[PDB]
Amino acid sequence: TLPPFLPCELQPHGLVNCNWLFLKSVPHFSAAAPRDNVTSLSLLSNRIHHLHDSDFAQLSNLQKLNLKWNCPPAGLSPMHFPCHMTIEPNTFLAVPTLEELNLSYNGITTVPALPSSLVSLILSRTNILQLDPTSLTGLHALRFLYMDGNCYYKNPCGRALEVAPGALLGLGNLTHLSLKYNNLTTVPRSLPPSLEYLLLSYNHIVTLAPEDLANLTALRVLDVGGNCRRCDHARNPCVECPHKFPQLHSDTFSHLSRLEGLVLKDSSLYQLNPRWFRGLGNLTVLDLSENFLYDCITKTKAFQGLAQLRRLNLSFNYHKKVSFAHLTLAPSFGSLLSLQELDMHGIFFRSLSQKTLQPLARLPMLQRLYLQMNFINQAQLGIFKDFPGLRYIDLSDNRISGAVEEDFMPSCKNLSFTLDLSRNNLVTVQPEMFAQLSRLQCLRLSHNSISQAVNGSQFVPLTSLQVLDLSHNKLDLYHGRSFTELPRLEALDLSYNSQPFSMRGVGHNLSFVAQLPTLRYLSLAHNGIHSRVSQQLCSTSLWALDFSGNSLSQMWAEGDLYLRFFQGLRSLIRLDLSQNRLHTLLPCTLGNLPKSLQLLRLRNNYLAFFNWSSLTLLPNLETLDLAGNQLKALSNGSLPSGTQLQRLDVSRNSIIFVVPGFFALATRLRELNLSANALRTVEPSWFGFLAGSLEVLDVSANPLHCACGAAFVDFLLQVQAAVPGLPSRVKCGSPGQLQGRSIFAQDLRLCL
Numbered sequence: 001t002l003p004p005f006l007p008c009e010l011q012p013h014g015l016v017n018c019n020w021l022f023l024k025s026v027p028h029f030s031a032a033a034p035r036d037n038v039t040s041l042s043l044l045s046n047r048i049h050h051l052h053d054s055d056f057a058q059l060s061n062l063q064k065l066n067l068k069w070n071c072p073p074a075g076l077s078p079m080h081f082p083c084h085m086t087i088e089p090n091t092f093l094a095v096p097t098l099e100e101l102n103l104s105y106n107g108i109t110t111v112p113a114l115p116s117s118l119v120s121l122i123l124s125r126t127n128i129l130q131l132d133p134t135s136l137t138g139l140h141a142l143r144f145l146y147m148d149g150n151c152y153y154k155n156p157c158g159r160a161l162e163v164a165p166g167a168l169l170g171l172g173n174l175t176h177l178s179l180k181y182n183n184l185t186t187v188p189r190s191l192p193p194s195l196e197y198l199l200l201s202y203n204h205i206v207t208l209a210p211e212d213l214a215n216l217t218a219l220r221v222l223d224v225g226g227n228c229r230r231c232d233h234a235r236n237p238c239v240e241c242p243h244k245f246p247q248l249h250s251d252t253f254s255h256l257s258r259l260e261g262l263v264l265k266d267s268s269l270y271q272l273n274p275r276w277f278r279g280l281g282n283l284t285v286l287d288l289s290e291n292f293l294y295d296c297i298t299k300t301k302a303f304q305g306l307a308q309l310r311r312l313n314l315s316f317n318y319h320k321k322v323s324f325a326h327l328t329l330a331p332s333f334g335s336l337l338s339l340q341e342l343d344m345h346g347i348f349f350r351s352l353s354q355k356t357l358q359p360l361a362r363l364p365m366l367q368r369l370y371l372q373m374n375f376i377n378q379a380q381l382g383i384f385k386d387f388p389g390l391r392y393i394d395l396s397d398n399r400i401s402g403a404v405e406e407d408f409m410p411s412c413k414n415l416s417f418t419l420d421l422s423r424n425n426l427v428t429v430q431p432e433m434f435a436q437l438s439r440l441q442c443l444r445l446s447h448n449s450i451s452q453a454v455n456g457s458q459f460v461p462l463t464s465l466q467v468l469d470l471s472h473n474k475l476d477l478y479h480g481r482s483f484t485e486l487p488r489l490e491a492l493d494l495s496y497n498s499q500p501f502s503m504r505g506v507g508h509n510l511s512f513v514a515q516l517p518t519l520r521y522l523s524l525a526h527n528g529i530h531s532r533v534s535q536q537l538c539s540t541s542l543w544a545l546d547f548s549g550n551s552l553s554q555m556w557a558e559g560d561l562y563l564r565f566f567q568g569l570r571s572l573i574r575l576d577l578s579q580n581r582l583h584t585l586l587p588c589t590l591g592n593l594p595k596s597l598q599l600l601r602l603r604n605n606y607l608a609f610f611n612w613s614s615l616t617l618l619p620n621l622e623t624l625d626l627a628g629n630q631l632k633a634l635s636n637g638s639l640p641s642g643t644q645l646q647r648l649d650v651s652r653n654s655i656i657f658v659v660p661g662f663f664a665l666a667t668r669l670r671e672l673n674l675s676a677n678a679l680r681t682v683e684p685s686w687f688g689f690l691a692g693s694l695e696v697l698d699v700s701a702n703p704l705h706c707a708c709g710a711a712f713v714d715f716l717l718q719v720q721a722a723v724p725g726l727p728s729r730v731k732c733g734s735p736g737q738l739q740g741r742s743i744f745a746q747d748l749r750l751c752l
């Protein structure tokens with residue numbers, strides 16, 4: 001049985017996925033295909049320029065249809081190729097079950113006839129330049145209409161979009177309307193009173209008053225930002241706000257009592273009118289980013305009584321000459337009694353002290369505080385001890401320098417208190433910086449130039465710290481007492497620290513790993529450890545070690561000094577020895593790895609041989625990863641009986657053949673990656689019995705020997721459930737004509 005929707009892929013939830021197939025038109029699927037099981041059809045990024053009456057006409061249960069990026073407009077086309085999509089009149093009418101349509105990024109100039117089942121319609125980046133009562137007549141179900149980017153720099157129209165008065169009044173269920181990047185100068189008259197989300201950003205609506213929002217009292221989100229922009233630091237075409245604008249009247253929003261979110265970013269505001277927020281008693285989110293409010297926020301009263309507000313964005317309110325603002329928050333920030341999140345990144349100010357955030361200090365719910373990219377170079381970090389609810393501070397990308405004058409490395413996201421000081425100019429860490437920060441659970445100091453002696457005296461106050469990121473620094477030398485002042489430490493990232501001339505004539509002392517009793521995850525990746533190191537790592541607690549990007553090759557050529565290097569990690573589960581220049585491997589060196597290992601990576605070494613019988617010496621191994629080595633074959637014995645191996649990756653080798661029965665004895669094997677090798681066939685004999693056990697068999701990017709009709713294709717059709725991208729991504733290597741084309745290309749489809 002062929003893939004039922006060739007060239008496309010059936011996926012979960014009745015989705016036929018035809019994305020990215022260079023298709024010139026919509027496939028006419030066969031009669032025996034389960035056309036009725038199809039509820040969603042995706043055709044993203046093909047090149048269908050002509051749609052017909054009969055294209056969708058027999059998909060009796062089709063609900064979602066995505067035709068995005070098929071006939072892109074000149075301006076959006078990389079090579080400015082003009083495109084005007086032809087759409088036969090009944091093309092969509094013939095899908096009377098259709099509920100969701102995405103026609104974005106296509107050269108269409110009018111709304112085609114749509115059935116009245118439609119609930120969601122996306123027409124963004126098309127060339128529709130008019131909307132009137134005849135445009136979406138009778139679509140009484142429609143809840144979402146998105147039509148952004150029909151007239152802007154990447155898709156110009158020489159004029160404005162025209163939404164006629166009442167054009168959409170017939171749409172009595174329309175709750176979501178977006179009309180950004182349409183070159184509009186006023187808000188369309190008489191929009192459905194049912195609207196709850198109205199996004200009008202990035203037009204040229206430079207003036208706003210309460211009648212512009214007439215009758216829209218169900219509005220929960222209003223976005224009118226980017227309508228009189230500042231252009232000093234784009235990037236892309238941008239029209240500056242004309243001099244005496246914007247003109248927001250003082251009671252514009254005062255009848256929108258259900259409003260939860262309000263966006264006034266990039267509106268060139270030098271000043272806030274307190275009256276704008278009067279009556280907005282449900283307002284939880286306010287975005288004032290990219291304005292000119294650096295001076296205003298030191299004295300404003302506009303925030304008084306926004307007692308329900310939970311998120312406030314003031315980011316990129318910076319002097320356009322590019323210099324420091326003097327930041328002292330106005331007292332009315334203190335009235336934000338419900339504030340959970342405050343974003344103040346990219347304002348630019350020299351100093352973080354007691355004065356700076358004073359009015360915030362006692363807000364009982366304030367949890368997240370974004371202060372990155374401010375070029376702060378003096379910070380009193382003690383100020384954060386007396387914030388009652390702080391969970392996260394981002395001070396990354398500043399120039400602070402001291403006190404005042406995933407499976408291998410977990411994230412800090414569920415922790416109670418995290419401070420990120422990455423990308424500052426920290427060279428040395430004084431322990432008094434954190435004297436008022438005993439409660440910190442996660443500390444990030446990556447991408448500094450820390451070249452200090454780490455000797456057990458740097459982080460003394462931080463008695464609660466569970467996670468320390470010191471990756472990407474200039475740490476010279478690890479001592480036996482390094483990090484031993486951190487009693488509760490669970491994760492430690494030291495990746496990308498490599499100063500081979502600065503070791504003071506000695507080597508790394510890795511005995512500190514044995515001193516950290518709660519440590520679970522350690523990374524020493526890209527440290528350039530060739531030599532000059534302790535002979536043994538020892539830990540009863542450690543679960544994951546990333547040792548990638550060193551030279552164990554050199555270590556293990558150096559006699560037998562380093563043959564038990566990892567053995568003392570009595571509970572190691574995950575070990576990454578990828579990128580270690582490993583040319584050979586003794587079975588005696590593999591058996592000296594911790595017996596508890598479940599997962600071993602050797603991505604990107606130079607291994608041309610592997611003794612597969614030596615996998616008995618790792619009885620608990622479940623995932624083995626040998627991607628990117630030089631295996632020429634899978635041979636020299638087979639996978640031995642009893643192996644617990646479930647995931648095996650041998651992608652990106654030069655595997656030309658596999659011996660018969662190579663995978664026969666691996667009864668737990670479920671996932672096998674054979675992608676990007678040199679295979680010319682796929683054989684059932686490789687798996688003895690048990691081929692139907694595999695849940696994933698990836699055989700893409702192989703130079704398969706396509707012939708009419710090769711039996712390996714029979715095999716892949718039999719186990720097609722496990723083969724990802726079978727209908728399109730499993731390709732031929734020969735003959736010359738079918739080279740790089742699908743194994744089911746027109747020519748070969750005759751031989752089935």
Ligand SMILES: *[C@@H]1O[C@H](CO)[C@@H](O[C@@H]2O[C@H](CO)[C@@H](O)[C@H](O)[C@H]2NC(C)=O)[C@H](O)[C@H]1NC(C)=O
Nearest residue numbers: 627649651652673674675676696698700701724
């Ligand atoms: C099998 O291996 C191939 C090649 O290594 C994988 O393809 C890569 O997938 C990663 C993400 O997993 C991408 O970053 C790369 O861009 C992909 N490269 C190529 C050439 O495809 C593939 O994902 C793996 N398959 C499975 C099922 O894990």
Ligand SMILES: *[C@@H]1O[C@H](CO)[C@@H](O)[C@H](O)[C@H]1NC(C)=O
Nearest residue numbers: 152153156157158159160183
């Ligand atoms: C926006 O409208 C003006 C005046 O109607 C026009 O000159 C300009 O070209 C339009 N912008 C685009 C991107 O087409």
Ligand SMILES: *[C@@H]1O[C@H](CO)[C@@H](O)[C@H](O)[C@H]1NC(C)=O
Nearest residue numbers: 479480481509510511512534
């Ligand atoms: C490692 O560190 C401790 C000092 O705290 C020392 O006693 C031990 O002998 C050192 N080992 C080496 C090889 O230098």
